[PDB]
Amino acid sequence: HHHHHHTSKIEQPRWASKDSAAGAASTPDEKIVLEFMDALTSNDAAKLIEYFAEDTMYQNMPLPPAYGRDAVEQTLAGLFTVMSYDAVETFHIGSSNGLVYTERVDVLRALPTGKSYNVSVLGVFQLTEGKITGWRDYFDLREFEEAVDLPLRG
Amino acid sequence: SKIEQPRWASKDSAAGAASTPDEKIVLEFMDALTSNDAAKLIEYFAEDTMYQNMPLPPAYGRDAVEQTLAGLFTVMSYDAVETFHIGSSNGLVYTERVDVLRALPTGKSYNVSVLGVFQLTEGKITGWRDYFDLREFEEAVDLPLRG
Ligand SMILES: O[C@H]1CCCC[C@@H]1O
Ligand SMILES: O[C@H]1CCCC[C@@H]1O
Ligand SMILES: [Cl-]
Ligand SMILES: [K+]
Ligand SMILES: [K+]
Ligand SMILES: [K+]
Ligand SMILES: [K+]
Ligand code: NI
Ligand code: NI
Ligand code: NI
């Protein structure tokens, strides 16, 4: 067992547009996505999975995709066993053609190690009738792993 | 040596097409990338810009950006950049794409899954940030970039 380490709080980057609309909802889809982000910090897969279509998809890119609502829940749940969302901060959101884009920092705690880390993520969401048909997050896995002693690949 | 379109790519035939003047530019900026000319690419940038491949430190200012590009270009070159999804809002443009990248010391290639954001002011880039996993690139082409 290891104590919860300090949770370093979130830098507001120099490149963060200070047009305060850039990080604000503008479509019903965008509104949904932002709401979904807020749900992450609940670390509850049953809460999250309701946002998804049956015919959906989910992938942290340095990690294998989950195809199908059933696969996605397993992946989500799997993740929630070694890590936990403390905070999700979306600097920029935007949409087009059914896709929504979020520039974020996620604040995560590796459960086994108790270590915390702030992750630069750019995610894309696909919606269809208010339901997530795809969710893909882009980030660098090695530096999260190293930061919190949690080898996640393989 | 091609790029297969992944089963999750929007079949919306507009999704990957440039939709606004800012998105036309970004799409052009990336054909320009296969030139692998830092001197040319910097044309698209404003003086008050920044550039970061997020696994690597940011480059602030146009001269930094150019140099960091030039440096990158010493060890690698693009061969292709296919863009599946493109969209925008509030002067930011997002691209989901695949960069085929070749390592100059080893000759080995790797297709990189990328999601990038661009900030434009009056048709000039004032921010370009690519999100991707660095490790699987290195491991693929045997070219370390973050010791
Ligand atoms: O932001 C990412 C980082 C860690 C894996 C899941 C999360 O969605
Ligand atoms: O697309 C990325 C992948 C390799 C590092 C630089 C490039 O911009
Ligand atoms: Cl799909
Ligand atoms: K700047
Ligand atoms: K917005
Ligand atoms: K839009
Ligand atoms: K488009
Ligand atoms: Ni231990
Ligand atoms: Ni301890
Ligand atoms: Ni501590």
Q: Please give the backbone phi and psi of residue B135, each rounded to the nearest 5 degrees, phi first.
A: -55, -45
Method: X-ray
Q: Which of A48, A51, A97 is nearest to A75 (CA)?
A: A48
Contact B142, B103 (CB under 8 A): yes
**A118/B76 Cα distance (integer angstroms):** 29
- As separate numbers, helices (DSSP H) first and strands (DSSP E) second, chain A gives 4, 6
B130: Cβ contacts below 8 Å, ≥ 6 apart: B52, B53, B54, B114, B115, B116
**B12/B19 Cα distance (integer angstroms):** 13
**CA-based nearest distance B104→chain A, Å:** 23
**CA-based nearest distance B97→chain A, Å:** 11
**B29/A106 Cα distance (integer angstroms):** 30
> Among partner residues A67, A94, A141, which is closest to B133 by beta-carbon distance?
A141
Tokens of B3: 């790029």
From the CB of residue B108, how many other CB atoms can be counted at a distance below 10 Å? 12
Report strand pairing: A131-138 vs A57-60: parallel
Question: Probe ligand 2: pick from B29, B99, B115, B133, max atoms within 8 Å of CB?
Answer: B99
Annotate chain B with DSSP letters as a single string: ---PPPTTS---TTTTS--SHHHHHHHHHHHGGGG--HHHHGGGB-SS-EEEETTS--EESHHHHHHHHHHHHHHEEEEEEEEEEEEEETTEEEEEEEEEEEETTT--EEEEEEEEEEEEETTEEEEEEEE--SHHHHHHHT--S--
A61 in B contact zone (CB under 8 Å) = yes
Tokens of A154: 């393989």
Domain ranges of chain B: 1-147
Contact B86, B17 (CB under 8 A): yes
Identify the three-state secondary structure at position A135.
strand
Give me the CATH topology for the region B1-147.
Nuclear Transport Factor 2; Chain: A, (3.10.450)
Q: Could you tell me the end-to-end alpha-carbon distance of chain A, in angstroms, rounded to an integer?
A: 24
B146 in A contact zone (CB under 8 Å) = yes
Contact A28, A100 (CB under 8 A): no
Beta bridge pairs of residue A110: A83
Report strand pairing: B50-53 vs B124-131: parallel
Annotate A93-106 with DSSP letters as a single string: EEEETTEEEEEEEE
Contact A25, A34 (CB under 8 A): yes
Measured between beta carbons, the chain A residues lying within 8 angstroms of B10 are 97-99, 126
B87 in A contact zone (CB under 8 Å) = yes
**A55/A57 Cα distance (integer angstroms):** 7
Closest residue in chain B to residue A20, using alpha carbons only: B90
Contact A104, A123 (CB under 8 A): yes
**A60/B139 Cα distance (integer angstroms):** 18
**A34/A26 Cα distance (integer angstroms):** 10
Q: Please give the backbone phi and psi of residue B44, each rounded to the nearest 5 degrees, phi first.
A: -75, -10
Residue type, A114: G
Q: Considering the domain A1-154 in this protein, what is its CATH number?
A: 3.10.450.50
**A34/A44 Cα distance (integer angstroms):** 16
